[PDB]
Amino acid sequence: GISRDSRHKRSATGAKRAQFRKKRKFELGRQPANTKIGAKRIHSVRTRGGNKKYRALRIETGNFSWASEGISKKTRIAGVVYHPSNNELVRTNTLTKAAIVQIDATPFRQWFEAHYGQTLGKKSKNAERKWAARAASAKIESSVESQFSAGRLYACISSRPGQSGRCDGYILEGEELAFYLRRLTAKK
Template identity: 40%
Template sequence: MAYPYQGRDNRLITGRIHPRARKKRKYELGREPTFTRVGERKIKKIRVRGGNIKIRLKRDMYVNVYDPTQGKTVKAKIVRFLDNPSNRNFARMGILTKGAIVETELGKVKITSRPGQDGVLNGVLIQ
């Protein structure tokens, strides 16, 4: 799998190669995607720019569910993965991203957080 280089493309529209003005920079680095799945909690810590830490969620079996009718948030266990409207391949593989739908003990929940970026699973109860 190729990781995205977030700089200018190497070729012009005509197909000619761009003359290199400089080398690639570390801040233009792309990283492998985090395919978050349902399972025993597993996180990965990554050092990012400025020495900060980004937590990537690899697997989790609990989600913080917000109930809009009661206005409360409860931690609920994920029973099973239902769908991921953002990508049909993610739906087939059971990958949790923002917008994915899972079934919990409380009912159907739509994931509202970005588990690969935030390191936590938050969701909203859908009727």
């Protein structure tokens, strides 16, 4: 099938290499997952040495990390808004690695309000003492808190769904967030 070797290519001098042997299984490649959004569907792959791979086909949610807060939450993925490799992946809402998406802001806001008592956007003694000890830490960033009003945080996929069956990622902060904001994720 798909052959992943270099014999079919031209040589560095441009010469047309002749056929050396038949295609081998140990040099194969598979069809892309083209992971979509919705109604989780994962097919296993038998790979070399056993070693199951998990093809993500149209899965719903994922695990996303707030690195400044050092927490990770299961969160639904809304859509793809940017992709550095192909704008058609944005168009078709295809989930690969490095695709910029919006997710929920919702479990992250409950965690933040339970951890600081601040109400991002606009009762116990133990809770109060914990919040006081965590004070001088609630101010995160205007460009992140702005997203919480719309209930959609910008996050980058750090997992390969077509290899692992997971849409994991991290919220954008700082210069990475500003880069994608200036680039395309503004302008609605």
